Ligand binder design. Structure first.
Ligand SMILES: Nc1ncnc2c1ncn2[C@H]1C[C@H](O)[C@@H](COP(=O)(O)OP(=O)(O)OP(=O)(O)O)O1
Ligand code: SF4
Ligand SMILES: [Mg+2]
Ligand SMILES: [Mg+2]
Lengths: 422, 206, 168
DNA sequence: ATGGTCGTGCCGCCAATAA
């Protein structure tokens, strides 16, 4: 009922539309990502931090200060959002800690904004069994508490209330002889109760995350939820334009390989070698090549250790930095046509040869190729004239009558394309 | 009933007659990972339980549920720490003298052998066996370079048992190789049951 | 018992090793029949065949048929011996069946017969549980002694090295 | 100081030839 901060238990039972299902997940992801920026760029006590975080919480329709009754909608929004996001960030151990840290930070912020006097009811509304002490009891034990106080300076027992807790729940405190124990009950200042509340929330959150992961295969059976569970961590020459080149200058084979890497977040050995050598051919160095491959493989939900000890050696050797130290030339188009035929699960090879016309037709169609050009390319392919067909593809996508060169190497394709484009 | 895995690898029940047409059954193994000395006792016991369940006369439905329950219990108990230290030992025999190994860095058992020679008493020579356990050191080296002696764990303080290694490289491979010919069980299912991350083993396509 | 079978010194028996026992056994066998032995010194051939299995689970009954003392039986059957088989990676041809038995099969027959004698005692009813294990160890040791005679034929440092015999 | 056949876990190494 205090919908402005809530220990997340009792999963909901309402039903919602799928559009709202995706909107809640994306909004929660956005807010939780911005919590990272606010916690990194600033410090935990400035007024600007509070102002920015509360303004963003207002922007995305999320619950804040309890003084205005019926904000039932933000309560429902947050309640559904946490549980929907529990399914995604429970897979990899690099994401569970990221979820827990920022959710604890958000709960700390929400706790710091409770005015002064609605805290007591909340403690009973979260199954915590805590208590307060009256003024006469505070005066009775004033000297005892201030003597039992931590390195906190001064004897002045301020207006901050003192809370009464079972001793077993204050393990982190009485171990260091920093609180007062009487009749099996610990007395704590209001400052230190935040630590125990967050520490007790963390264990329950981790237990809930673990118990959801092992019963999550049953939920993957639904075909409508696959994009959500796998794309919440999805998304001279530099790194930040290669995608554009995929549409503009790459030949169909290497464009297909780039699309495969973008979508599946993995590639087989033949595609790896071919694309890596071409990508060296365009001009990349070792550092950004390693950056590119590791960035494309981490999105496959694998930690950097596996990539570093598995693929880094081959990637480095491709450029000639280990072994005989031999630098290699990108594959000639003839070997792409004739060597290492593709199989199931593989995307390498020449599309104009290995792909059947019943697939090559829509492969041309998806690339905005004119139907007359499509028919001409199909006729050329049927005649086993592949290079001239690839040249015709280049002319059609470049809007020129004749290219002016003989093509035998995809790097030549890229260089000729960039000669006129740039 | 016979489970044949590969060449020189099969488990079976042998029929022993007693009298008047009555016969008992005795479990026998040939070539499995449970009969070798280079695997921890934990993985061998789990594999023995799985073999005993598969070769039983029960319906094929009940055995999968029993395996799931037992694997969940193992996954909880390993992280809980209720299993004694002595069941985390791996025993390997030495062929040449420990000082003669050129690849001493990359082999765990010889690494333990040089230590036990260099500080201890009785010197281990060719033909002797060495027991080693993989523990957490915190220096961010590979698993094969983090071998420690059985007595090196109960004496020092900074070391603790590496549950990830024994749960993803000791238990999982044995039960994955055993249940290959049977249907309904796969590597990803065992990974989820044990509480591991499925992303490493097979997955991939979204 | 092993030292009384091979004829070597008893102290060498307790140190293990299977080449020395075979060396002395063949030395006694050849010296008894008025021969001259070679002087002391101052994978390599095709092995067994394993069939392609059919991986999986079987609920029905399965028979398993096994040969008794395969390689010694082959040696006794085809009269495989140093004297009877010509030699110089090539498989020699089988010898003529009219010629009498050689030195090797007569000596391996005794080991086979001793193992068969031990198994008959093992067959007896109402035996002490420790006695049955002792007899099992005895028959295993005799089986290894019988099967090491074939292995010594392919040891490059043996006094009686002969690759073609093992190949055959 | 017996022979051979089979599988499982760690490492390093290689292909390439337009312009
Ligand atoms: N340790 C060994 N050394 C050399 N050859 C061996 C050894 N073990 C087995 N062999 C060879 C020779 C044997 O004739 C053959 C088959 O052995 P195996 O099946 O164990 O027994 P076996 O056929 O000699 O009879 P048995 O069943 O009576 O023990 O393999
Ligand atoms: S002809 Fe050569 S460059 Fe063109 S798509 Fe085929 S492999 Fe690529
Ligand atoms: Mg690989
Ligand atoms: Mg046999």
């Amino acid at each position: 009922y205090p919908h402005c901060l809530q220990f997340y238990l009792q999963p909901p039972s309402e039903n919602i539309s799928l559009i709202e299902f995706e909107n809640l997940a994306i909004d929660r992801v956005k807010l939780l990502k911005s919590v990272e920026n606010l916690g990194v760029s600033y410090v935990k006590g400035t007024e600007q931090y509070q102002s920015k975080l509360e303004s963003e919480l207002r922007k995305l329709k999320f619950s804040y200060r309890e003084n205005l009754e019926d904000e039932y909608e933000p309560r429902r929004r947050d309640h559904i959002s946490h549980f929907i996001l529990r399914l995604a960030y429970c897979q990899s151990e690099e994401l569970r800690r990221w979820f827990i840290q920022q959710e604890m930070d958000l709960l700390r912020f929400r706790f710091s904004i409770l005015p002064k006097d609605k805290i007591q009811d909340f403690l009973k509304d979260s199954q915590l069994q805590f208590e307060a002490i009256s003024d006469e009891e505070k005066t009775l034990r004033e000297q005892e508490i201030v003597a039992s106080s931590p390195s906190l300076s001064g004897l002045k027992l301020g207006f901050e209330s003192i809370y009464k807790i079972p001793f077993a729940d204050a393990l982190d405190l009485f171990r260091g002889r920093k609180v007062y124990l009487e009749d099996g009950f610990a007395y704590v200042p209001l400052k230190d109760i935040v630590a125990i509340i967050l520490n007790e929330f963390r264990a329950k959150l981790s237990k809930a995350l673990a118990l959801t992961a092992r019963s999550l295969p049953a939920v993957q059976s639904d075909e409508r939820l696959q994009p959500l569970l796998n794309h919440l961590s999805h998304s001279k020459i530099s790194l930040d334009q290669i995608d554009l080149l995929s549409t503009k200058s790459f030949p169909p084979c290497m464009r297909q390989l780039h699309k495969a890497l973008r979508e599946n977040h993995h590639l087989r050995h033949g595609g790896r070698m071919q694309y890596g050598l071409f990508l060296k051919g365009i001009g990349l160095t070792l550092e950004q090549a390693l950056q590119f491959w590791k960035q494309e493989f981490i999105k496959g939900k694998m930690d950097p250790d596996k990539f570093d000890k598995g693929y880094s050696y081959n990637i480095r050797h491709s450029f000639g930095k280990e072994g005989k130290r031999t630098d290699y030339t990108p594959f000639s188009c003839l070997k792409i046509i004739l060597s290492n035929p593709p199989s199931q699960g593989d995307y390498h090879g020449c599309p104009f040869r290995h792909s059947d016309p019943e697939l090559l037709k829509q492969k041309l169609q998806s690339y905005k190729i004119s139907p007359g050009g499509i028919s001409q390319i199909l006729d050329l392919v049927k005649g086993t004239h592949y290079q001239v067909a690839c040249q015709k593809y280049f002319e059609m996508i470049h809007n020129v009558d004749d290219c002016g060169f003989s093509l035998n190497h995809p790097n030549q394709f890229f260089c000729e394309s960039q000669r006129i484009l740039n | 009933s016979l489970l044949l895995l590969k060449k020189k690898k099969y488990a079976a029940l042998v029929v022993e007659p007693t009298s008047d047409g009555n016969y008992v059954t005795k479990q026998e193994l040939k070539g499995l990972d449970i009969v070798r000395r280079d695997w921890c006792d934990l993985a061998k016991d789990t594999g023995n339980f799985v073999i005993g369940q598969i070769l039983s006369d029960q319906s094929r439905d009940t055995i999968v549920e029993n395996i799931q329950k037992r694997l969940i219990e193992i996954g909880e108990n390993v992280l809980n720490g209720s299993v004694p230290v002595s069941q985390f030992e791996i025993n390997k025999a030495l062929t040449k003298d420990p000082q003669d190994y050129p690849d001493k860095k990359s082999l765990p058992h010889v690494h333990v052998a040089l230590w036990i020679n260099s500080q201890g008493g009785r010197k281990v020579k060719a033909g002797d066996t060495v027991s080693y356990v993989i523990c957490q050191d915190g220096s961010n080296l590979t698993a094969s370079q983090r071998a420690y002696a059985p007595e090196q764990l109960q004496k020092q303080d900074n070391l603790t048992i590496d549950t990830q290694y024994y749960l993803a490289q000791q238990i999982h491979p044995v039960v994955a190789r055993i249940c290959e010919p049977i249907d309904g069980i796969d590597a990803v299912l065992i990974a989820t049951w044990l509480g591991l991350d499925p992303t490493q083993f097979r997955v991939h396509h979204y | 018992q092993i030292t009384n079978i091979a004829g070597n010194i008893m102290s060498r028996t307790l140190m293990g090793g299977r080449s020395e026992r075979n060396e002395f056994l063949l030395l006694h066998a050849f010296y008894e029949n008025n021969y001259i032995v070679p002087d002391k010194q101052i994978a390599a051939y095709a092995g067994g065949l394993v069939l392609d299995p059919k991986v999986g689970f079987y609920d029905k009954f399965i028979l398993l048929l096994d040969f008794n003392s395969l390689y010694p039986s082959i040696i006794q059957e085809f009269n495989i011996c140093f004297t009877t088989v010509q030699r110089v990676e090539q498989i020699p041809e089988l010898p003529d069946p009219s010629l009498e038995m050689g030195i090797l099969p007569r000596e391996i027959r005794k080991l086979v017969e001793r193992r068969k004698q031990v198994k008959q005692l093992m067959k007896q009813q109402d035996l002490n549980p420790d006695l049955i294990l002792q007899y099992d160890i005895r028959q295993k040791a005799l089986k290894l002694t019988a099967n090491s005679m074939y292995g010594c034929l392919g040891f490059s440092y043996s006094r009686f090295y002969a690759k073609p015999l093992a190949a055959l």
